[PDB]
């Protein structure tokens, strides 16, 4: 796995998150995006359970994001909204046993 | 269940004729396909005729075409078969057959 | 040897004969099914097909007056019941007057990417609808074409044709010997199982759980389907002899496929699966075995694949996922199923089947059925 789709956003701005399989790998597998933030350390953003997936979010997304998949069920997204300061991190997408490099996402202050 | 019973076999001499009847009970006789089959001795089992529910849609062996003509009273359970211009090679027992089930039979010779 | 090659399609979307209705004929796509006994075909425009028979245009055609409805596992259809004309163009040489339904309704029975539009039930008269009153295609066909009760199945669409034999057997489509299996029912075509091996070892259950409540022979059903006890026992004996370290709990459903990159196969990671029937002289047994190539099932540069193997109700069903493997003959005249090895049943050249005896039954009851 590999994310994609990071980088810099301006307060309130969208970004969406892309994570897809490498290797032998199980369809619509049990999925998780967790996020290194500066200072904060590791923060759990998103769930979704293995085939008919239940999604779950961390307290602080409050309906911003969507975490989905693509119709061959072996792709991931994270479709964020509304994004702020406290948003910047570093992403990682982790897929049944594997994760990826991570995404850096940055939101500006300024900006 | 089904019950089938035929009648009218005979001895004749070649160029002979008889009339065969079969009476039906146990089921709808007047929404059944029904069929006349022979078994000659040393000989494998041989179709002779077939009559759709209603006595329009007819079809014959090309052994016994312009020979013999199958008919059915469907207000008195009974099918018929006539046999005209009779030859030693009709020489069988002729069975009256619906959905897997035949009757008793009726011998025919013709010497 | 003219029906030799008569019928196409796969364990997937089914196997089908072409078939000629009426006066003037049309032709027909029909799915050849060993589990049920209506022969039925589309009578009206369908979403999901591209011909449909019209009793308008055909001048033999007469109605019977009446409705039928019949339920499948998965799909049903209602339709009128009547009369008319057929011929099998790929193997007889005349017409024959049988029994035939029009669909005008039907929920999940004509599927997307389908190619067949109608239905042949080649099962025995008391599973007929309405009642078993209603001559079946194959007892019209019997009579009208002097031929003996008895038909074969040999499907060779195992990965990535076939033939149906009305009256016989064709020696050109086996090799080796035929194994028979009494017919204890006749229904579906309802034969007595007494054990399942995977990789060699036996499951740890009664002979009777696997003729719970039938164990049955239908070429309409796609996978090997068996009851719920059975199956959680074959999934835990295939996960254990495995190379695959760790399986997810949605493959086993059907809800996860397994998916490999590259040009890689998957079964050199699966055990083989045998199962034992018992021969004519009850004291004996043969096992028919089938190769991971015929129950992982083909569906980034990946190629997925699914369990070919389903739980059941009250049935252990041999579908077309295991008859791809064999030839396969429905001997009704002397009561019993016939297995042999299949030349056309090979995946890139090998075999993906066996089948071997004798056997002892000593270590089984004499009587598996409940
Ligand atoms: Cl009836």
């Not at chain 1, 909204?81 to 939101?107: E, F, K, S």
């Not at chain 2, 005209?84 to 013709?110: H, I, M």
């Not at chain 3, 002899?241 to 949605?250: H, K």
Request: charge should be neutral; aromatic fraction near 12%; hydrophobic fraction near 35%.
């Amino acid at each position: 796995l590999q994310e994609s789709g990071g980088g810099l956003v301006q307060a309130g701005g969208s970004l969406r998150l892309s994570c897809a399989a490498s290797g032998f790998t199980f369809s619509r597998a049990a999925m998780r995006w967790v996020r290194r933030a500066p200072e904060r350390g590791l923060e759990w953003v998103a769930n979704i359970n293995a085939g008919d997936g239940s999604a779950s979010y961390a307290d602080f997304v409050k309906g911003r994001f969507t975490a989905s998949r693509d119709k061959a069920g072996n792709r991931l997204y994270l479709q964020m909204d509304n994004l702020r300061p406290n948003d910047t991190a570093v992403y990682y997408c982790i897929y049944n046993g594997h994760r990826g490099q991570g995404t850096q996402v940055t939101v500006s202050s300024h900006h | 269940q089904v019950q089938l019973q035929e009648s009218g076999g005979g001895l004749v001499q070649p160029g002979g004729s008889l009339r065969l009847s079969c009476a039906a009970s146990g089921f709808t006789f007047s929404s059944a396909i029904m069929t006349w089959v022979r078994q000659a001795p040393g000989k494998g089992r041989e179709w002779v005729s077939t009559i759709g529910s209603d006595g329009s849609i007819t079809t014959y062996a090309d052994s016994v075409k312009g020979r013999f003509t199958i008919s059915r009273d469907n207000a008195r359970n009974t099918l018929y078969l006539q046999m005209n211009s009779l030859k030693p090679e009709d020489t069988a027992v002729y069975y009256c057959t619906s959905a897997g089930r035949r009757g008793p039979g009726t011998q025919v010779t013709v010497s | 040897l003219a029906m030799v090659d008569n019928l196409q399609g796969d364990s997937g979307r089914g196997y089908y004969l072409e078939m000629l209705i009426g006066t003037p004929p049309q032709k027909l796509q029909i799915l050849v099914d060993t589990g049920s006994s209506n022969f039925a075909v589309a009578g009206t425009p369908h979403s999901y097909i591209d011909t449909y028979f019209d009793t308008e245009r055909s001048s033999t055609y007469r109605s019977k007056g009446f409705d039928v409805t019949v339920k499948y596992t998965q799909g049903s259809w209602t339709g009128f019941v009547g009369e008319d004309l057929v011929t099998i163009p790929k193997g007889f040489n005349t017409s024959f007057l049988v029994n035939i339904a029009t669909i005008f309704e039907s929920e999940n029975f004509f599927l997307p990417g389908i190619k067949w539009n109608g239905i042949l039930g080649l099962a025995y008269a008391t599973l007929a609808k309405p009642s078993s009153s209603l001559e079946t295609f194959f007892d019209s066909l019997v009579t009208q074409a002097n031929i003996p009760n008895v038909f074969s199945m040999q499907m060779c669409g195992a990965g990535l044709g076939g033939s149906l034999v009305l009256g016989g057997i064709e020696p050109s489509l086996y090799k080796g010997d035929i194994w028979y299996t009494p017919i204890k029912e006749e229904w579906y075509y309802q034969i007595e199982i007494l054990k399942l091996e995977i990789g060699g070892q036996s499951l740890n259950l009664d002979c009777r759980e696997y003729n719970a409540d039938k164990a049955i022979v239908d070429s309409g059903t796609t996978l090997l389907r068996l009851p719920q006890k059975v199956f959680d026992a074959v999934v835990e004996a295939v996960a254990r002899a495995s190379l695959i370290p760790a399986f997810s709990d949605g493959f086993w459903t059907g809800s996860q496929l397994a998916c490999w990159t590259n040009s890689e196969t998957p079964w050199s990671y699966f055990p083989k699966i045998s199962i034992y029937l018992r021969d004519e002289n009850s004291s004996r047994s043969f096992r028919i075995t089938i190769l991971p190539q015929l129950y992982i099932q083909p569906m980034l540069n990946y190629e997925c694949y699914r369990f070919g193997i389903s739980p059941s109700t009250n049935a252990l069903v041999i579908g077309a996922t295991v008859m791809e493997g064999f030839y396969v003959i429905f001997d009704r005249a002397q009561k019993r199923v016939g297995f042999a090895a299949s030349p056309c049943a090979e995946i890139a050249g090998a075999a993906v089947s066996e089948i071997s005896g004798p056997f002892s039954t000593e270590d089984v009851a004499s009587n598996c059925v409940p």
